[model samples]
Target: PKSMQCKVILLDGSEYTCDVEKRSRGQVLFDKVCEHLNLLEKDYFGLTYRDAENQKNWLDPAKEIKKQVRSGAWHFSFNVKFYPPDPAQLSEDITRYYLCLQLRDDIVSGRLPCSFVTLALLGSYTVQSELGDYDPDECGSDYISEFRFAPNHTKELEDKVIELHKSHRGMTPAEAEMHFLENAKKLSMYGVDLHHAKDSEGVEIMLGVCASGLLIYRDRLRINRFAWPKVLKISYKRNNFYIKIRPGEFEQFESTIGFKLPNHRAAKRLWKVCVEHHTFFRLL
Candidate 1:
């Protein structure tokens, strides 16, 4: 089973690996991972794989392991599949630190971008959570550099984080956790998932879907938006994807906009992501 037993690297990869037997499929492999994580809430996470299109995708839980793993390749990634506003679920769920782990992964992977001040602030809260307090005797000056906020890591950021962590001496991990979630929510990309695409004009752009709306970005800036209530329907025909929207209150009919994906598969994939997010966020 050397080719079958698989390894999964999880969140922000400090080389953490999850080992599992490959005889079963995703449910077995996935559950073993959940059990390894002390039974974390399983719905918000999934393993990653590359589809035939070579686009990154979620590993199907009901499918065979090696089938998706493809020939002899033994490695896969554990990715944050769905980003909820918060990971808090059932009362018995061990989500206090679970949520902390998700947010940290999001920020580190560029999936969730943050400003410098917010990074320093969030960075310190995690520091406070782990180290408990700022004690020069117990914490070395270079300790902050061990791991820093990840849009980019720097020594000055380390200095800022150390200064910030100094103020949270009495705060518990749960207390610092609350502070982390509060500030993390302020980021514009909080729950937005980005996809690469092109406008009808053939201009390169990014499409973002989140709790509130559909966000359109260009040159790394938000240039347009389509709120849930404003959208009528979404579909993809051939290689083009469209969102039909109510342009204005007076419009008798819907106005539509579309984007061109690299291929029909990507178009369908994007349409699926939009529909799923819309249903999960807007309807529920």
Candidate 2:
């Protein structure tokens, strides 16, 4: 109890009960933590120690001695460097790369900690928001088909659908039979042929059936879902692959491809001409 409780006589002479185990006064905690860390003062380094035993209780003597530094409108808290909003894709990419280089140099030069550099790199535009937002289907006229996955099909397709996705991906020797089973299901059920789609030409202009292509492209863009739980169903027919991405994940898959899907007019056109037709599961 002696170590856990304390009674403080306030300036006005009233006794205030405080539980030391639980933080009651911010100032007291700050002082205790700093003193315990020995980060308030020391010698030699441009930094000082607070709680000597704890590496984290160190402080920079050059700035923000007692105040908390924060990320401001134009300056990053870690380096106080000005940052501007970028409108162009190339500009954004360049800025991110530039910041990464700068942070790397700082770390190498021993001017910054690896953890701080890592956090700064994360703040850069290219990787700022990993699960990013972008408008697709903005130029619907330019696209041919828009097969959207159902909500249940988002990111990680529930592991169930793998049975249908075999033909397109090259298989390891051990997984060949399983791959064939998946391919067979897709072919028998959807009349899909991954081979014909790749080898054929003059494929019809079935608007928006390119979800697979988009997925391939998404993988190229490093936007892949590392762990897709469900399987994709695919088959090729008449020189085009008929693919049905499970429903729940389609919205996200559509976004990954940079398009809005399930355009009725497009769907109707595809119904007639597309070698592949798909329906997504999980709407809501």
Candidate 3:
């Protein structure tokens, strides 16, 4: 197969070029780019590109390059996904700077999908990363206006930014980034693309499978948790799914929780996610 030449542009306008086999998986090119950048936590980022219709999409690691990517010369952006990055590995200033860029992008693009209060707070952290503590005098400066917030909400955004800035008083850039990540990771839907489902009780819920475990959410509130360590087994039968929980360290009773999906396909799909998450987080 012919090789496809692609250029990956980082947020700072730096670029890395590579030629990959057309039949290669997206992971191959991402690995090369990560190696080029010497990224310590490579999995925290992914290659993003616009399709024919100019719709943005992430390159799936498991899919073939030719299947998702177009032929000939192409340009892609190395962007951060919603996943909470491993903070311990973010030791370098440049790495933290990149994270700041991603947070800025998420804020402006509404990818973070939170209220103006949340967006302004996160945006303030990015500001702190770039310029250090906030100054009312600098509010009207070119650097501050560079970040766009909704016009109607500009006053509210600015007010919240200053409010958040007060809380991070006297923090260094590195410390500010660490603080930002710690708080951002606490968001209920952090790093999650929620799948809509309902429990056996007919209560609507959102299911998110991540590196830690299966998180159950009711709207934006995380009402319950099903950690991988506590789950002894997960299985599905027709339109029903079950999670068998092992007895707690102090408890003597084991319990099985059942969920009823609308169809066998949905049930199996959720089952597969549980199995994959278990293998990736626990078995591996």
Candidate 4:
């Protein structure tokens, strides 16, 4: 069997040259490259190459090199695949940084569903981590060309990027990623799809009943919170849904507050959701 040398290029432009048998599977070469890079989280990354047609493709580990590549000195790039992935699952610093890049693509491609304001918040953090601080003297259209897909509010995004980048001064890419996740996690609507609801005052609100707690949101702004511990009981009557709570010792407030739903059916549905959430969160 004839063996030849190939180069594996990483996103950071680092390259690794290795020898592989003519019939060796693409996975074999991918493993060697991953081992050389000392990558512990291999499942999140992959080796990609351009075919003879110049189309980008990821190497299938099961396919032989002869079937996957036509050249002897083939070049491949290391890249992440998971999109809109949970930040909590990533451990390595570089892995987190790559995850940020995937999120950037998601925003640019309109895959991440959010308002421009929310996008600006996250996009600013992304720019800080990937490109450092913004400078009009040194920065130009090329610096922000990647975010051209941003809404007509691109200027707002640029302004936020500069503001966020200042706070991230002297921070490494890894640290910037950490900072981004920390802030993103604080947003009440983060990773959640809120259901529309209305309080007794007929004020419009959004209810997010999940394993965490009963979250009340007004126009994407988290207004009130009800942790399971603070909730004493939940019940509903007709079109009214009531939550019994143990108020603070220092405060004078109603032990029970009721929300008027559109109808008895809506009230029951919300009540059921609250039951399921409380049971799962408390028992599981």
Which numbered prediction scores highest in lDDT against the true structure?
1
Q: What lDDT score goes with residue 164 in model 4? A: 57
Alpha-carbon lDDT, every model: 0.76, 0.27, 0.70, 0.66
Error of 3 at 10 (Å): 5.2
Residue 26 error for model 4, in Å?
1.6
Task: In model 1, state the lDDT of residue 194.
Answer: 82
The alpha-carbon deviation from the true structure for residue 4 of candidate 1, after best TM-score superposition, in angstroms, is: 3.4
State which candidate has the highest TM-score. Answer: 1
Runs with alpha carbons beyond 4 Å of true place in candidate 3: 5-18, 47-63, 67-89, 100-119, 133-144, 148-152, 162-172, 200-203, 218-222, 235-244, 247-284
Cα error of candidate 4 at position 221, Å? 25
lDDT of 2 at 34: 30
lDDT of 1 by residue, 136-173 (tens): 77557665556657778887788888889899999988
lDDT of 1 at 121: 94
Please state the error at residue 203 of candidate 4 in Å: 41
Clashing pairs in 3: none
Residue ranges of candidate 1 with Cα displaced over 4 Å: 1-3, 12-25, 51-54, 62-67, 70-74, 86-93, 138-144, 219-222
User: Distance (Å) between predicted and true CA of 40, model 1?
Assistant: 4.5
What TM-score, over all chains together, does every model reach? 0.83, 0.14, 0.65, 0.47
How are the candidates ranked when ordered by lDDT, highest leading?
1, 3, 4, 2
